[PDB]
């Protein structure tokens, strides 16, 4: 949850 992959 609320994880960012960029």
How far is the C-alpha of 4 from the C-alpha of 2, rounded, in Å? 7
Q: What is the resolution of this structure in A?
A: 1.3
Tokens of 5: 């992959």
Q: End-to-end distance of the chain based on CA atoms, in angstroms?
A: 15
Method by which the model was determined: electron diffraction
d(CA 1, CA 4): 9
Classify residue 4 by its DSSP letter: -
Alpha-carbon span 3 to 5, nearest angstrom: 7
What tokens appear for 3 in the block? 């994880």
Gap between the Cα atoms of 6 and 4, Å rounded: 6
């Amino acid at each position: 949850n609320y994880n960012n992959y960029q």
